[PDB]
Design a protein around this ligand. Structure first.
Ligand SMILES: OC[C@H]1O[C@H](F)[C@H](O)[C@@H](O)[C@@H]1O
Ligand SMILES: [Zn+2]
Length: 472
């Protein structure tokens, strides 16, 4: 049977199922409704930065169609919707003046979701730093971001928190550090060789530290000022792709573990244990900032749940640990990526080159967090795969590969849960085909097809798969 034994009965009672989007990727109205530009608006509008010179000006136009999209998610039997608030839609300059039309939009969305029995899970930040804050303060390089983010978060708690009870601060600060400041391929396009300037060996760590400090400050504000009345929760969303030792050799096993530590431990060790991973301290040394005891105590325990974005897996090959001139966060790991073992690829690829379809990676990741971090409450906040550009509507709708993807990954998640992992929910990236950053509209992650000429929505087979699986 195409559900493969999966249904709500196959998951814990009250387990949450949802879909996910992000503001810039679906809203549109990027320069309308009072919204100020984000760093992604400037980036996307620069010729050559995005596939086809595309941008999120219109995107899926969810801004005008949100009731259609909410009706669709309810008809597909989902319990929840993870979306983000655009910082520059509320504060066009990131600070000071409030854009009331922006506030009204999120009020309207949140109220309609609740009207339809859909639980809002709200991200405050998804790659979309107000451009004004980048220019005035230097964005995530400036420790002042803690105050600036806290003030923004405070406004959101005050304005929406009587209705919103499930918050996330950030989405994937590792990717911001990696792509924005190590490789320099996402805004602000910083790296050692980059035209904008930078230092791939230092800036990724500065940025990560400031994300953690800003997270902790925003949560401290929530807990001291809003929690008593509002009785909600605040977490953070982290990407974690699985790393598997190429062989059982001491050095390959060490390499896979180093990769885990530099990937997820970088944030989870501070959040759970109040310090950076030991290996990062040992290898990165004085390029890794130190939490004072007070900061570490503010950071530790500051996530009510951990959002995990899980997509793929890689084999890791080791080497003798070397004394090396620092060059980048990426080279700091001292590992070698490998995508085949015993003559077989780890998995076939989806449309995105980085996305190897490896369902057991999901078990790997969830089991690892359970065993290593005292089984914290985890929410899978994104999981999915993409189709390529240029297909016919019908070809998009017959997404049999995506159906197989969800059945397999969810079976592996069920396996980890049945072994005792504290996973509270699962969210499919994405409800809709949308703006896939550098790939623009050439990558289609949705369970619902979006015709980007007419903006019409059409559920794909995977959407119907979810509807069947999730019926009450
Ligand atoms: O790459 C697919 C998807 O991966 C993660 F979920 C990111 O948070 C999204 O912004 C992105 O679109
Ligand atoms: Zn419109």
């Amino acid at each position: 049977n195409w559900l493969g034994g999966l249904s709500r009965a196959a998951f814990p009672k009250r387990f949450v199922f949802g879909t996910v989007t992000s503001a810039y990727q679906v809203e549109g109205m990027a320069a309308s409704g009072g919204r100020g530009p984000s760093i992604w608006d400037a980036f996307a509008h620069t010729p050559g930065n995005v596939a086809g010179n595309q941008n999120g000006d219109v995107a899926t136009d969810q801004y005008h169609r949100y009731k259609e999209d909410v009706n669709l998610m309810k008809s597909l039997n989902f319990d929840a919707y993870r979306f983000s608030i655009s910082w520059s839609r509320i504060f066009p300059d990131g600070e000071g003046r409030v854009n009331q039309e922006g506030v009204a939009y999120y009020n309207n969305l949140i109220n309609y979701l609740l009207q339809k029995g859909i639980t809002p899970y709200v991200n405050l930040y998804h790659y979309d730093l107000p451009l004004a804050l980048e220019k005035k303060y230097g964005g995530w390089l400036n420790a002042k971001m803690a105050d600036l983010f806290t003030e923004y978060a405070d406004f959101c708690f005050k304005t929406f928190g009587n209705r919103v009870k499930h918050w996330f601060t950030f989405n994937e600060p590792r990717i911001v550090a990696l792509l924005g400041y190590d490789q320099g391929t996402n805004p602000p396009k910083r790296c050692t060789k980059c035209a904008a300037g930078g230092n791939s060996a230092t800036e990724p760590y500065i940025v990560a530290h400031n994300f953690l400090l800003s997270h902790a400050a925003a949560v401290a504000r929530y807990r001291t000022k809003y929690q008593a009345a509002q009785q909600g929760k605040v977490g953070i969303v982290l990407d974690f792709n699985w790393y598997e030792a190429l062989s059982n050799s001491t050095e390959d096993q060490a390499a896979a573990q180093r990769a885990r530590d530099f990937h997820i431990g970088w944030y989870l060790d501070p959040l759970i244990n109040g310090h950076y991973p030991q290996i990062m301290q040992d290898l990165v040394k004085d390029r890794l900032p130190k939490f004072t005891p007070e900061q570490a105590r503010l950071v530790k325990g500051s996530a009510d749940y951990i959002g995990i974005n899980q997509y793929t897996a890689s084999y890791m090959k080791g080497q003798q640990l070397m004394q090396q001139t620092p060059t980048s966060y990426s080279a700091d790991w001292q590992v070698t990526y490998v995508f085949a073992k015993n003559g077989k690829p780890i998995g076939p690829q989806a449309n995105s080159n980085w996305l190897y379809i490896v369902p057991w990676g999901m078990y790997g990741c969830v089991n690892y967090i359970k065993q290593k971090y005292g089984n914290p409450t985890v929410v899978i906040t994104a999981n999915g795969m993409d189709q390529p550009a240029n297909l016919s509507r019908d070809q998009y709708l017959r997404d049999t590969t995506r159906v197989h993807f969800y059945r397999s990954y969810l079976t592996q998640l069920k396996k980890a849960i049945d072994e005792g992992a504290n996973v509270a929910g699962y969210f499919a990236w994405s409800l809709l085909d949308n703006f896939e950053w550098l790939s623009g509209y050439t990558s289609k992650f949705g369970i619902v097809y979006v015709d980007f000429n007419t903006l019409e929505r059409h559920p794909k087979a995977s959407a119907y798969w979810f509807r069947d699986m999730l019926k009450h």
